[PDB]
Symmetry: C4
Subunit: 302 residues, 4 copies
């Protein structure tokens, strides 16, 4: 008898994080880069992409090419990413980039442009796909293959990972890997915690990510019609955490995608919230690597 | 010739409930607990969970494990439930817990923590699944099995039931069971009524539940984009009942799930409504068991 | 070479209707009654109902019984219909009832209760289903069978029809039938027009209905989250027609369903609009039969 | 090794367009005409239409006729188109018509009526369908067949194209064709650019279109509930571009469909935005052909 799920975690007693600056909230802004990395027969894929694009009802096409799907992704790398990088640089808030190995190759300039802005480049896997079914063998060297590309693309290896479309073996291999300080393949808490089942023994930091305060909802069945739906949602999820942080601060992730929030219609909202957030004192805008290194010092694994 | 459906009920003449305090409305706040109880091959299930999670387009996976799906549920037990329990305790309004036997085992501390707050623990079945197809035999001892777990988990047996994903045999077996005062496997009225087709002869109270003033809509195709959609909906459904209650009071159910409303973004709305509701006199916040025992005394079965 | 579709109609020259009272708009409020008439193995159906219910992602079940689905419909006949009848009687605006033969049997009291309020009872077919595939033979006597039930249910035959889920043969048979003054199985205009392809030769009036200013959208993938979405939509579609009616009045249909708008949450919106509409002079609230008889006198078939 | 996708385009350096009048934004209003051109067994199709109609969950029917689907399209040609033509003529802003060959035949009067208003008639293909799978041979003379119809329908050939539901061969054949100045079968930028892979050698202008600032979203799973969702979206996507245009102007496409925006409920929003847009100086309302000819002179292919 063994349950491979921790349904309880900290329970009624979440640790206090003591965010630098005495912030009542810690905000993680995340910009993915998957454009170019997505499904495509050109990449070897047996079908075209269908996930997160204006084509909200798109289906995959076996041994076909979704020219439309492709164009919409192309907006993310071509136009969307730039516009967002100005927004964040504009307010001096830093980013964590969930960058997919194959996309980074295909647009190394923009990666190096991020790296120079001081944004942290976290690994988003070798390719933007669903690992759920992948064989353990072929999945393990996607990771090391991804680990190699970004080190050579960036100058330093990635000490963070996030697959997203995880298969079971995924979070294990991350931890078995070695050189990662954290992962984000959880949406299970409002705070970071050390992975309880690390075979490796070495401390492993978990920084849960989000599928609700994620701009991906602008293209899902359930999701924002206008910008303001995203914004009101972010304000809400801010207000409630800030209010809690008067005695017990927590964090909040914000997921952005080049092809979605980068569209001017939706960018308006993202800036709206930034300004909102910025108007409150005791807010720590930060990269996830900093949250990991903050945790290490603050609440070292025991 | 026999129609097994009562399409008429009270017709033009709903009974007046005389809610304690002379309230013009009776409000039933319900917090489900299904996290840990849901579909999973670890539980014997042939496929992973797909119902009510941020993964609004998730499909079931035969003999697979949806690590993502699991994590999102894990948020309900780990973080969501606690935050909500503070909200309700915060306003001194009481709850009725629709608790699923298997989840209660997996987190007995939080169940006992509820029981101590004074919230009523109603049965939500042995496992959170779709009974629609289950064989009468194997379904009947899920119930008694569920009936045993919560008595031993709580100190008293459950005198209420709600499966949700009912099969035909379900509401019968509930009534054939014996020790239940009511059930909630109806969404067919704005007031409680005695089950008209109880083979058992013994009075059986029906307290219709809701799939519209339910936070579940935040993850369905049709459903709230921002918090305010839930809230405006609740205000509306409040305003119209309160206005009616000037001469004929009725009730209103509110369905909450740990993994959904417990997310800070959506909690803001839930509190918004509570405050709204609280600002009106002649409102009876109550547990369903109290509504059953209120009915017994007020409008005894004949 | 023959195109069985009139893509042009009145073109740039819609006729002026000269609505009684010199109204700048004519409003058709329609309340369906399908509850009890819907799909069900008890009715002979090979599967349960799945269309328009809170169960926004429900699927049909072959030789099964959706107890949940049924309960939600039961709300329409049990509670929803009554509450709405008060709303409309409350403002003295009259209704056109799209009543399905099988539902009318199952709740004759409420039908006769409508008839006494002075509302017009239009035929909605024998059963609430999809005729698209039905054989011409078995479909033709559904209609006459439906035609018989409501005459005996009401005192007068139905001079109007609307199937909704039409099959090709449907609108023909309506016209071949004989005693109907109009039908509504079109959503193709903002005004009534005589059917251009009536084999019968006898004048046939078309009164297009709506699938957008229909409360059905509260349960479809695309559709209102809160009441206000319905209301804002109705105000818009009112404002634009009223503004046009300064020189060229038109009509507007409003589709309501017992099980959907009758829920207090959504009723609030419906009343909101009524009040809105009521606040403007030169608005003709009317039954469709009156619109037919108005047309006859005003713009007789040539 | 050859990647058939330009993921980078202008990168960090989009060209300045110097819009006539020194406008800080260039607005492309587009009204499609597909009604009559859509899928239908009468047209040879093996199934009925299912894309973009109030029937938001409609499925295609093999060798069948969706009478309902048809009626809803019929609203676009019969009523919707006219009402919109007044709106745009009302404000003196000009249109680009994406007109589908088969629809234009079926309603030549309305086409010639557009042509006389001074609106540009761009080709939207021979038939409104999905070319993705079409054989290169039979697809190539759809285009020339479409090219012939509109020249004879309009007086001048179409120097622009947009299929929408493109297959790979599509944009190639457009360029191989010869007499087109641009195409719009991209959604990959916020500015026009010369096609980088034109086999023909001759300059080919790309004017990316939109699937987000498109009224089509009113009938998709993700999309506007009320008018205001469309409008707020347009204001946002306007505000952000206008703000950028203080130093670097760009354009914005607006997709409209007769059967969707032409409904009074949604027309209100479209006018709302027009007025909004109109209230700002330095806005260039224009046809796409003018944007092509503007580009030619301003930023000639090299
Ligand atoms: N964050 C993401 O875009 C993602 N990565 C894998 N699956 C996803 N949804
Ligand atoms: N209330 C519930 O979460 C539920 N229980 C069974 N099916 C459901 N939707
Ligand atoms: N109006 C209706 O509810 C209807 N009737 C047949 N199909 C429908 N959608
Ligand atoms: N713009 C359009 O309506 C379109 N044309 C082809 N596919 C589409 N969605």
């Amino acid at each position: 008898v063994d349950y491979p799920r921790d349904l309880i975690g900290y329970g009624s007693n979440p640790p206090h994080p003591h965010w630098p600056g005495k912030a009542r909230i810690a905000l993680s802004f995340v910009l993915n880069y998957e454009e170019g990395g997505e499904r495509n027969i050109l990449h070897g894929d047996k079908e075209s992409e269908a996930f997160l694009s204006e084509m909200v009802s798109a289906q995959p096409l076996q041994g076909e090419r979704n020219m439309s799907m492709e164009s919409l992704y192309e907006y993310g790398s071509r136009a969307g990413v730039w516009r967002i990088l100005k927004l964040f640089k504009a307010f001096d808030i830093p980013l964590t980039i969930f960058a997919v190995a194959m996309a980074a190759q295909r647009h190394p300039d923009v990666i190096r442009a991020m790296v120079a802005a001081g944004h942290e480049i976290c690994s988003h896997g070798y390719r933007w796909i669903d690992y759920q079914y992948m064989d353990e063998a072929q999945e393990r060297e996607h990771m090391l293959e991804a680990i190699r590309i970004l080190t050579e693309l960036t100058g330093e290896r990635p000490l963070g990972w996030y697959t997203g479309r995880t298969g079971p073996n995924t979070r294990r291999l991350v931890m078995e890997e070695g050189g990662f300080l954290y992962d984000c393949d959880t949406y299970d808490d409002d705070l970071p915690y050390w992975e309880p089942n690390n075979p490796t023994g070495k401390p492993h930091l978990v920084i849960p990510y989000t599928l609700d305060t994620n701009d991906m909802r602008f293209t899902q069945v359930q999701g924002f019609n206008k910008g303001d739906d995203f914004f009101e949602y972010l304000k809400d999820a801010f207000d409630v955490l800030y209010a809690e942080g008067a005695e017990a601060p927590k964090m909040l992730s914000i997921g952005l995608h080049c092809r979605l929030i980068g569209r001017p219609a939706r960018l308006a909202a993202l800036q709206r919230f930034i300004e909102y957030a910025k108007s409150h004192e005791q807010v720590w805008f930060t990269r996830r690597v900093d949250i990991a290194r903050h945790w290490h010092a603050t609440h070292p694994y025991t």
